[PDB]
Design a protein around this ligand. Sequence first.
Ligand SMILES: NC(=[NH2+])NCCC[C@H](N)C(=O)O
Ligand SMILES: [Cl-]
Lengths: 284, 288
Amino acid sequence: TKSRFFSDETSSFVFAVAGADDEVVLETIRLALKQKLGKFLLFGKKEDKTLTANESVTWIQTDTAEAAAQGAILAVKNKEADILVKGFIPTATLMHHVLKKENGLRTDQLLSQIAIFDIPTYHKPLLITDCAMNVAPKTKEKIAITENALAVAHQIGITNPKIALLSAVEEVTAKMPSTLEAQEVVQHFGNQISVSGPLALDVAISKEAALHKGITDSSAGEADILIAPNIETGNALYKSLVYFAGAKVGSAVVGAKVPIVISSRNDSPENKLASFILTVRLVE
Amino acid sequence: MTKSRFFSDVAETSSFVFAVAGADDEVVLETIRLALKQKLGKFLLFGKKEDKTLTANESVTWIQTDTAEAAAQGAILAVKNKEADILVKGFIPTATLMHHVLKKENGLRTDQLLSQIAIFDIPTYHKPLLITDCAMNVAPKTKEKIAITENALAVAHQIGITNPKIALLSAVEEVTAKMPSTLEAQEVVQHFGNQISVSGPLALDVAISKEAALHKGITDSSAGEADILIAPNIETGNALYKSLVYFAGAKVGSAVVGAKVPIVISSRNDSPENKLASFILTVRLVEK
Ligand SMILES: NC(=[NH2+])NCCC[C@H](N)C(=O)O
Ligand SMILES: [Cl-]
């Protein structure tokens, strides 16, 4: 038996979809509506009548990638939408406008990507950040990445998240800069939260592995959140769990005024839906 | 449906000789006991505290050594003298053994870079998967990555993978100055030309899933069938290795390659099964 984040969830929250075109985008919206997960503002070029006939869907004709992105952003800025979803446009096209402070979405806070996994071989939900956004986050960025993850954990009901700064090794050395940054982040929080690091992955998610290395702190063997040392590590972990460990995952960009869905071209419908679910739960 | 597995549950056997630098403690001894029970090979045990039950095995030779230095040097000389085929790092600091090995003058290395490599039988993948470097080279750049790729090619061929499909792993497919590992991947790819099947940068999904590659608009027959992954940095290699072991249920053996003989350097936290699978890999690496 175990605790799963994606068990058996509804709302009137509004997703603004930037580029509501192509089935790779629409399939997820169909599933969301069938479950009554939320409502949709669809900024797109070619209307799907059988979809736009749903009472909880509104279609806005938008002929270019740019107008779709700007349409969706303005909807969030005007407070008509709770959640921003990237559709059939380059991520860059959306991000450019999201990151313009004038648009009300980006504040003082670093944005970061975060994913939550139900891994059949782990005993509870596991969060991992940052797997897709921040490329080479240093100590400063990793502190903010951790703040975001903390906010996310709290919003979703994990009251005292065990946080582990991932690296390849537990010793702090000049040879491996990610170890020092881990130590400095752990130092930043002191007693404020449950943080440990640097930790190799085994020590983070396996109490037996932890004990064998003479480590008996919480985040070791019982991590709720892994802070990736770099983006290659976060991404690889993410993909590994999905493709080899059979994990269900939902992902979002957080740190902005609303959650942002930015899904991969080859994410599964179930995982794409998972991400919508995650964003609903982030807007409470 | 059909999967090709590198490791067998029929005891594989040999008369190759492991020289064990520091043959003490169960963390070291247990793997040896398992290998003997399987007739995997023969052992030279350089250690301080003799297990008389273990050393009553004809395939085992005990050499009383009181210091890690003497154990490291003894094991290394056994290799130089052609008395041993494989070097095993025992209950001594790694640096005490490596410092010696890494100095070319001692006879065990060439100018070729040394690297760690691991072979995985993953329940949800259809053939053995090699990943390097998960444990040794910390922040390899282009030149090191090239050498790491050379070592993986050599390992690949020796174990019977004649045309290895190699993926340089990164977070993205698109090359950008914002992510140096993408530039580095590209350069490694350029270095090899059409001498081998090598692609990169690729995210994991494009490397080990044909569907994902396609859905990403990548249609090369090389895609989704990687035999070897080259990690962009040690945190990535290590995290991936651990992920496969602890979440994916993979069996894995690993060795340090690039030197004149294979070296076993197992983690304190490697299971006995994976430590054994490591002995087994090294036997495969010296098989004539
Ligand atoms: N070759 C190995 N035994 N690798 C597993 C150990 C991983 C790494 N050396 C660590 O300390 O976390
Ligand atoms: Cl699960």
